[PDB]
Amino acid sequence: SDRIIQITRGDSTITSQDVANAVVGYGVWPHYLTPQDATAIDKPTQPDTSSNRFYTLDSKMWNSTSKGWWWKLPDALKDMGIFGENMFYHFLGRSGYTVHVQCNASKFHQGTLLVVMIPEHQLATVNKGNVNAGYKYTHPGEAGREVGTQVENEKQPSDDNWLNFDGTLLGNLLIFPHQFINLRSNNSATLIVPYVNAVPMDSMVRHNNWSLVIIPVCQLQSNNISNIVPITVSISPMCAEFSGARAKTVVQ
Amino acid sequence: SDRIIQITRGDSTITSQDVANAVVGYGVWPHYLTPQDATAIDKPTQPDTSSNRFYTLDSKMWNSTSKGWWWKLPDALKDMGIFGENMFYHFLGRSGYTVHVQCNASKFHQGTLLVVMIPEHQLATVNKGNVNAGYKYTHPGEAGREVGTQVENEKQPSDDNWLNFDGTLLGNLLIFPHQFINLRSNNSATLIVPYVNAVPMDSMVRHNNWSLVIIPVCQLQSNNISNIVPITVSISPMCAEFSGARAKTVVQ
Amino acid sequence: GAQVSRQSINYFNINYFKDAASSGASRLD
Amino acid sequence: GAQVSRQSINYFNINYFKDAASSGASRLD
Amino acid sequence: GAQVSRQSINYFNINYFKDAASSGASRLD
Amino acid sequence: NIGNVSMYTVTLSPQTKLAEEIFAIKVDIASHPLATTLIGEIASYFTHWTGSLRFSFMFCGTANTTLKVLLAYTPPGIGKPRSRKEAMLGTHVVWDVGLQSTVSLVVPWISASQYRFTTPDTYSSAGYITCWYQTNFVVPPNTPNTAEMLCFVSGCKDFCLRMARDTDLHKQTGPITQ
Amino acid sequence: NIGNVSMYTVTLSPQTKLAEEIFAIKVDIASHPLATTLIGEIASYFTHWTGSLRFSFMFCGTANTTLKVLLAYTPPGIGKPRSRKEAMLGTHVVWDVGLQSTVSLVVPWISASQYRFTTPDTYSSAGYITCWYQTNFVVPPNTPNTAEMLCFVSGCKDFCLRMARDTDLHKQTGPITQ
Amino acid sequence: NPVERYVDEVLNEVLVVPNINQSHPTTSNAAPVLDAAETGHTNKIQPEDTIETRYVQSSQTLDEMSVESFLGRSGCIHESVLDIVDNYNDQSFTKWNINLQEMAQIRRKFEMFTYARFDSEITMVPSVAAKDGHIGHIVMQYMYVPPGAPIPTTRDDYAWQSGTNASVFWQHGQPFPRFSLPFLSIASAYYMFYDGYDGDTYKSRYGTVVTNDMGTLCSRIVTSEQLHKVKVVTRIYHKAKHTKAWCPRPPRAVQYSHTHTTNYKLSSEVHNDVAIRPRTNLTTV
Amino acid sequence: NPVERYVDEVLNEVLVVPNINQSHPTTSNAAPVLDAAETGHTNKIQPEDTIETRYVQSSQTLDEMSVESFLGRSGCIHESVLDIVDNYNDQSFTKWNINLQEMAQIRRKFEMFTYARFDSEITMVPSVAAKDGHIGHIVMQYMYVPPGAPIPTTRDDYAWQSGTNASVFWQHGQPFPRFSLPFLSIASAYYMFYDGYDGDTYKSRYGTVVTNDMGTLCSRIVTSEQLHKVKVVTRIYHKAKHTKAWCPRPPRAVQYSHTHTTNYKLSSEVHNDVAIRPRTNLTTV
Ligand SMILES: Cc1cc(CCCOc2c(C)cc(-c3noc(C(F)(F)F)n3)cc2C)on1
Ligand SMILES: Cc1cc(CCCOc2c(C)cc(-c3noc(C(F)(F)F)n3)cc2C)on1
Structure with missing residues (x-):
């Protein structure tokens, strides 16, 4: 059946009985760093099944007024088991991911989520001159950011979903790896992305490679509104490898 | 030269210019678990260079009245980088070690340390009936235990060095893998031990496989006593592998 | 009477009485 | 059943029960 | 184990235990 | 519930808090909620066990009821998980309810020793199976707001029992007469 | 000394008289100072012994301390030697302390019978090991005027034990309880 | 090489369990973990299908779980009492209607199958309690009276002659008596359960009593009256040999x-x- | 010629010790007698290197020093007492938590190794003391109750049926009972020592009690109450067969x-x- 999926990573298996295929970002499957592209000379540590497994983030509630949610990777996985430990004990890290967004309702509900994975999503600030988004704002952790809620501190990034929080139009986000969760068709989205960067490995603490953006383009409607319809995200690193070991970095 | 050594493990290199060879416990070099001896079916995580590297414990001061020191493994390495993290996130662990004890003085100093690695060193309590050594006493961490100092709590283990803290005579400790640091001859001891146990992998938290015992059999003497003569221990796991991943165990 | 077999490690598998009910536990598989 | 051997000084090395735990002391070396 | 011999009048000369001290009286001459 | 068929069903329903716990049991083959199952009863006639266990769950709501649930196995050496986050760090299956009503979670043999004791003995205590809400239990209007789930258990290809013994799941306290 | 690590060390120092005695023990494998060693403990589970013994000594003074010592083995049929001259007429090793800290003296199997009793029984009493100063213990100024020596024992290629028996180096005078 | 067969018997490695093979991460639309219990079939998923397994070489064997092993151990099935109190002629003999239903331990194991066919090994353990101080010379007679044969009504009944029935005479101080019995049913297997009657009226008997008539075990102290009274208790043990069982059921x-x-x-x-x-509740381990 | 192997077994010449060869006076700068104990290795010097030896043909053998020989002798591991004083029902049965730690003699030998794997031969020596003058007919039952099985709480507990447990019935006047047990651990070897706990808190148990649970030995006088009281003491002897031992340690x-x-x-x-x-001092032999 073209509408079922079982994804096994490490000791975790995820299933869905109403999928819309899977997307492999830019058509490249995650793979380890080769000696021709490598640059940092020490031998990498590859946790394998202990880090390359599904980690489920905190659930979010989708209601008729939701404006969107975003998470940044690898930041969202910073307090997640062995993968999280490895990103702080090492200067460099490299990894691909399998992102599985889950949201089920019923055959009498309607709504649509645009699920996108953006490489280098450099956020903008609005009407604040040359002051850029502050570190702690773009590093929310597994809780991500719920668009349209935050108390206006100065280095707070843009919260304009129609302008992709960066000065470009929402309708064009489809140029990045993405899927839609249209409630009448599917109840999950699966995106598998490779490591994308201009250097072979990078700081997992100062640089976020991908951003997961979920925007409800079609409002959630039904005639049973008291039933909460959550959205859950499960992310699994793939081919994670780290280099340049030392003491554990403590942030903020 | 038969009296020099360079030991490289991961990103660490240790040297000594006055050694007395090296001892390979029971003549077996550490190796990974084979499928014929394995039992836990999930694929192990092997941190490699990030865990198999030298970790230097807290130094101890050797003076004319010292009675000895002991550490238990893997316990002593519990708060040590990636190796330590792995032993708490996993139910099972398995590992061999390279133990390098360091102590230098001068050609006008004399003294002798018996450095021993004991498998299953089950401590005894003295004159307390059937009450056995308590968990926190046999899990001192990197600080180990300085024989002859502790404040008599009830579950405190024996502090009788001549009876090996277990009811057997000190002179017979030589049946276990060992070396001596005789100040006139060498300034370090190197023991490389394999994984020894009746099961292929075990709980790194409830079971300590080896105990490092250092007893000064010949008192430290010199005519410059104000110069402190410390003893430093550096331990490097070898072929460390873990299995049965989950949340991090929090002890005590 | 019994079934001697050879390879040399003979397995004299004796049955001491003349009734089938008299023998010990059965072979498996 | 047991391991008859020949040279003639046969060594009928019998094992009377069907479990390995039942036999006597082991051969050395 | 024991020393079977043939001519036919076999002389199964058995030694039931694994120690030399256990056997009976020695042969003469 | 004992003495009713309802002792075999777990009830699910629309939640108001996220990631709630559904059930939690020990994974030991002869431990308590599973001692009276067939595999638990047979395991109780032997002293040792080894191998992987297969837990299955069948959803019994309407064909219009949806739900995503996380079934997790926590290896030993730690307490039972207190949250879905803590649980999902172990072995787990995210089950999406749909046309196929049943899912299976395999508890792999993850042990120090090759076998474990079948009777409740700490050292050889195998961990826990917990179930949590991955999303929620959603239904359209005019549909029952609660539904049951049945739980099954059996052994995998590597399951094996050893050292026969008498059972403590049955007794005789007087003569059985004509 | 019993109850201290010092029961394992012999002290050496600058002498004022020549050829002084350092120590003297019986060579019998299960006799007294050596009954509690590992070879002595194992020998105590057997009734007979045979073979040559290997005694080793490790000097633990400073690297600037010198010394020459005579280690001697006196075969039976005579009393223990009373002087270095009397001792050196038997089997002996003159040990010069230097870069190599340890020396070994082999007590050859010199017996009438092929075996001897492990327990203290005159007829099969093997002789003595004595140690004397060959020269002196010399040190430069500002150096400790005393130093220790450790003594070891093991068996040579021809060592062998026979006739298993219970040991008298350990006992039980009451019940060992739970 | 049957001899090879013999070696496996000695080491108890006749039935080996399979190995766990190495598996890898997968992403496909074949979902083994998903199925339908409604079908009445167990999902056939193995560990390699859900987690990523390593290669492990299984050494376990299933010999001990065989039906032969499970039912092949002697268990007590009856405790016979001959208690001499005040009348030797009346108390020195007794009888028992044979069955494997009186002792819960073995009854429960056999009842895990619907039908079972096996030969039996019976071992008897007699013990003579000296109530007054002496046991004298106790000789016992245990006689198997198949259904129809005459049952003794006195300690000297002619039926004790045992002209055709099987009797085992045991003498105090000799090994415990033991003998084998072949599969005795008039059918192909013993009924552990029987949903039937011996007639079609409201007074017909229901159950295994209709099919499992095995006869009577008559026993007596052969020795004549002694001054001192004894209490002889004979425990009967049964073990199944050459067993076959059909249609397993709930315990x-x-x-x-x-x-x-x-x-x-x-x-x-x-x-x-x-x-x-x-x-306590659904979440209390 | 295995037969040759058999002859060596009979004469106990399987493991021979080497010969002493003739040596001569030497003058060189290779000094075998000199070494460094700091290395943790024993100096490998032999008699030929220090004295001038003659050629001697060694006949000694090491068979008796094998681990099989050292641990292969029956030693007492327990003395069970059933003393009838004033209540037969309460005193005619007892139980023991199995272990090899109560008798110093054998415990010490096994404890010279860290791990040991072996099969066991158990022999029992029962002796009935006639406290009032008569022993009657004593029949004993020794039952092995593996961990988990029901433990009897009365002399007539249903657990004595022994439907699945192993029981040995002994009758006074017959040879001493004896049986073999295979290696029973859930691990690959028995732990003689264990530096571990069963938990990670201040109340967790430490030591071999965590790993060496062997079950219980339940025994009873099968014979019913007799007029004369007896005191039955059963001594259990254990012997290791097919032994392997690892990591030797100080006694x-x-x-x-x-x-x-x-x-x-x-x-x-x-x-x-x-x-x-x-x-007395360093120089007093
Ligand atoms: C179902 C089912 C299966 C069986 C066979 C039970 C074997 O039963 C016995 C027993 C327990 C004892 C005797 C018996 N005890 O003593 C004697 C003899 F020695 F007197 F022959 N026969 C005979 C049978 C058929 O019974 N019901
Ligand atoms: C370590 C270590 C090694 C061992 C094996 C000890 C063997 O122990 C016994 C003993 C001594 C007696 C019985 C026993 N005594 O009687 C019976 C039976 F006859 F009732 F089966 N079983 C069973 C075991 C497992 O125990 N701890």
Whole structure:
């Protein structure tokens, strides 16, 4: 059946009985760093099944007024088991991911989520001159950011979903790896992305490679509104490898 | 030269210019678990260079009245980088070690340390009936235990060095893998031990496989006593592998 | 009477009485 | 059943029960 | 184990235990 | 519930808090909620066990009821998980309810020793199976707001029992007469 | 000394008289100072012994301390030697302390019978090991005027034990309880 | 090489369990973990399908779980009492209607199958209690009286001659008596359960009593009256040999009440009648 | 010629010790007698290297020093007492938590290794003391109750049926009972010592008690109450067969105190607690 999926990573298996295929970002499957592209000379540590497994983030509630949610990777996985430990004990890290967004309702509900994975999503600030988004704002952790809620501190990034929080139009986000969760068709989205960067490995603490953006383009409607319809995200690193070991970095 | 050594493990290199060879416990070099001896079916995580590297414990001061020191493994390495993290996130662990004890003085100093690695060193309590050594006493961490100092709590283990803290005579400790640091001859001891146990992998938290015992059999003497003569221990796991991943165990 | 077999490690598998009910536990598989 | 051997000084090395735990002391070396 | 011999009048000369001290009286001459 | 068929069903329903716990049991083959199952009863006639266990769950709501649930196995050496986050760090299956009503979670043999004791003995205590809400239990209007789930258990290809013994799941306290 | 690590060390120092005695023990494998060693403990589970013994000594003074010592083995049929001259007429090793800290003296199997009793029984009493100063213990100024020596024992290629028996180096005078 | 067969018997490695092979991460639309219990079939998923497994070489064997092993151990099935109190002629002999229903331990194991066919090994353990101080010379006679044969009514009944029945005479101080019995049914297998009657009226008997008539075991102290009284208790042990069993079933959950019937007692608080222990709630391990 | 192997077994010449060869006076700068004990290795010098030896043909053999020989002798591991004083029902049965820690003699030998794997041969020596003059007909039952199986609480408990457990019935006047047991651990070897706990808290148990659970030995006088009281003492002997041992260790120097623990008592004058005898001085043989 073209509408079922079982994804096994490490000791975790995820299933869905109403999928819309899977997307492999830019058509490249995650793979380890080769000696021709490598640059940092020490031998990498590859946790394998202990880090390359599904980690489920905190659930979010989708209601008729939701404006969107975003998470940044690898930041969202910073307090997640062995993968999280490895990103702080090492200067460099490299990894691909399998992102599985889950949201089920019923055959009498309607709504649509645009699920996108953006490489280098450099956020903008609005009407604040040359002051850029502050570190702690773009590093929310597994809780991500719920668009349209935050108390206006100065280095707070843009919260304009129609302008992709960066000065470009929402309708064009489809140029990045993405899927839609249209409630009448599917109840999950699966995106598998490779490591994308201009250097072979990078700081997992100062640089976020991908951003997961979920925007409800079609409002959630039904005639049973008291039933909460959550959205859950499960992310699994793939081919994670780290280099340049030392003491554990403590942030903020 | 038969009296020099360079030991490289991961990103660490240790040297000594006055050694007395090296001892390979029971003549077996550490190796990974084979499928014929394995039992836990999930694929192990092997941190490699990030865990198999030298970790230097807290130094101890050797003076004319010292009675000895002991550490238990893997316990002593519990708060040590990636190796330590792995032993708490996993139910099972398995590992061999390279133990390098360091102590230098001068050609006008004399003294002798018996450095021993004991498998299953089950401590005894003295004159307390059937009450056995308590968990926190046999899990001192990197600080180990300085024989002859502790404040008599009830579950405190024996502090009788001549009876090996277990009811057997000190002179017979030589049946276990060992070396001596005789100040006139060498300034370090190197023991490389394999994984020894009746099961292929075990709980790194409830079971300590080896105990490092250092007893000064010949008192430290010199005519410059104000110069402190410390003893430093550096331990490097070898072929460390873990299995049965989950949340991090929090002890005590 | 019994079934001697050879390879040399003979397995004299004796049955001491003349009734089938008299023998010990059965072979498996 | 047991391991008859020949040279003639046969060594009928019998094992009377069907479990390995039942036999006597082991051969050395 | 024991020393079977043939001519036919076999002389199964058995030694039931694994120690030399256990056997009976020695042969003469 | 004992003495009713309802002792075999777990009830699910629309939640108001996220990631709630559904059930939690020990994974030991002869431990308590599973001692009276067939595999638990047979395991109780032997002293040792080894191998992987297969837990299955069948959803019994309407064909219009949806739900995503996380079934997790926590290896030993730690307490039972207190949250879905803590649980999902172990072995787990995210089950999406749909046309196929049943899912299976395999508890792999993850042990120090090759076998474990079948009777409740700490050292050889195998961990826990917990179930949590991955999303929620959603239904359209005019549909029952609660539904049951049945739980099954059996052994995998590597399951094996050893050292026969008498059972403590049955007794005789007087003569059985004509 | 019993109850201290010092029961394992012999002290050496600058002498004022020549050829002084350092120590003297019986060579019998299960006799007294050596009954509690590992070879002595194992020998105590057997009734007979045979073979040559290997005694080793490790000097633990400073690297600037010198010394020459005579280690001697006196075969039976005579009393223990009373002087270095009397001792050196038997089997002996003159040990010069230097870069190599340890020396070994082999007590050859010199017996009438092929075996001897492990327990203290005159007829099969093997002789003595004595140690004397060959020269002196010399040190430069500002150096400790005393130093220790450790003594070891093991068996040579021809060592062998026979006739298993219970040991008298350990006992039980009451019940060992739970 | 049957000899190879013999070596496996000695080491108990006749039936080996399979190995766990190495598996890898997968992403496909074949979902083994998903199925339908409604079909009445067990999902056939193995560990390699859900987690990523390593290669492990299984050494376990299933020999001990065989039906031969499970039912092949002697268990007590009866405890016969000859207690001399005040009349030797009346108390020195007795009889028992043979069955495997009186002792819960073995009855429960056999009852895990619907039909079972096997040969039996009977071992007897007699013990003479000296109530007054002496046992004298006790000689016992255990006679198997198949259905129809005459049952003795006195210690000197002509039936003790045993002209055709099988009798085992045991003398105090000699090894425990033991003998084998072939499969005795008039059918192809013994009925562990029988949903039938011996007639079609409201007074017809129901159950295994209709099919499992095995006869009587008559026993007596052969020795004549002695001054000192003794109490002889003979325990009978049974073991199944060369066993076959069909149609497995659920194990007995409540205590047995009577022989040949599945009848049970139920108290006011039912959780005390079954081995199920009350859970505090769904989430309390 | 295995037969040749058999002849060596009969004469106990399987493991021969090497010969002493003839040696000569030497003058060189290779000094075998010199070495460094710091290395942790024993100097490998032999008699030919220090003295001038003659050629001697060694006949000694090491068979008796094998681990099989050292641990292969039956030693007492327990003395069970059933003393009938004033209540037969309460005193005619008992139980023992199995272990090899209660008798110093064999415990010490096994404890010279860290791990040991072996099969066991158990022999029982029962002796019935006639406290009032007669023993009657004593029949005993020794039942092995593996961990988990039901433990009998009365002399007529249903657990004595032994439907699945192994029981040995012995009758007074017959040879001593004996049976073999295979290696029983859930691990690959028995732990003689265990530096571990069953948990990670201040109340977790330490030692071999965590790993060496062997079950219980339940026994009873099968014979019913007799007029005359008896005291039955059954001594259990154990012998290891097909043995392997790993990591040798120092022998126990002080008395044992309790089972499963290395705990010891120390008095005010410690030389009385060890076998070391005080020397008058360094030079007094
Ligand atoms: C179902 C089913 C299966 C069986 C066979 C039970 C074997 O039963 C016995 C027993 C237990 C004892 C005797 C018996 N005891 O002593 C003697 C003899 F020695 F007197 F022959 N026969 C005979 C049978 C058929 O019974 N019901
Ligand atoms: C370590 C270590 C090694 C061992 C094996 C000890 C063997 O122990 C016994 C003993 C001594 C007696 C019985 C026993 N005594 O009687 C019976 C039976 F006859 F009732 F089966 N079983 C069973 C075991 C497992 O225990 N701890």
